[PDB]
Amino acid sequence: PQITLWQRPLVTIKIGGQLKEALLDTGADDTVLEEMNLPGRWKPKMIGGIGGFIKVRQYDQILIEICGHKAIGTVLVGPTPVNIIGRNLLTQIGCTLNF
């Protein structure tokens, strides 16, 4: 589909059974979701955005379905006021900017 930008580019995502809302974010290197458990191994990481850094949990080789599109990769979990789909997974569903 083609998503215009008059509104926030929010879509539905499925991860580990649960359905969630998430922002398709081209200004994000990383994918970061609201605090939750994910199966298996994780590492502490620090990420930086506007107005500071937050401490998160890095989970590798995680599957998320985004608008009925398979995408596997690193998923960060932490105190984010919004679920953020970053480039690492956007590339995986063939997401591009056009104008």
Ligand X SMILES: COC(=O)N[C@H](C(=O)N[C@@H](Cc1ccccc1)C[C@H](O)[C@H](Cc1ccc(-c2cccnc2)cc1)NC(=O)[C@@H](NC(=O)OC)C(C)(C)C)C(C)(C)C
Query: Which sequence positions are flagged as catalytic?
Result: 25
Half-sphere exposure of 70 (CA within 13 A, CB side): 1
Nearer to its own copies, 4 or 17 (CB): 4
Of the ranges 9-17, 35-43, 60-68, 81-89, which one interacts with ligand X (CB under 6 A)? 81-89
User: Among ligand X, its own copies, none, what does residue 67 contact (CB within 5–8 Å per kind)?
Assistant: its own copies
Who's near 21: CB < 8 A, 6+ residues apart?
10, 11, 12, 13, 83
Binding of ligand X by 24 (CB under 6 A): no
DSSP annotation of 6:
S
Who's near 59: CB < 8 A, 6+ residues apart?
38, 40, 41, 42, 74, 75, 76, 77
Nearer to its own copies, 5 or 40 (CB): 5
Question: CA separation (Å) from 38 to 5, 45, 67, 97?
Answer: 31, 16, 20, 30
Site string for its own copies, 46-75 (x = CB under 8 A): -xxxxxxxx------------x-x------
What residues line the site for its own copies (CB under 8 A)? 1-6, 8-9, 23-29, 32, 47-54, 67, 69, 80-82, 84, 87, 90-91, 93-99
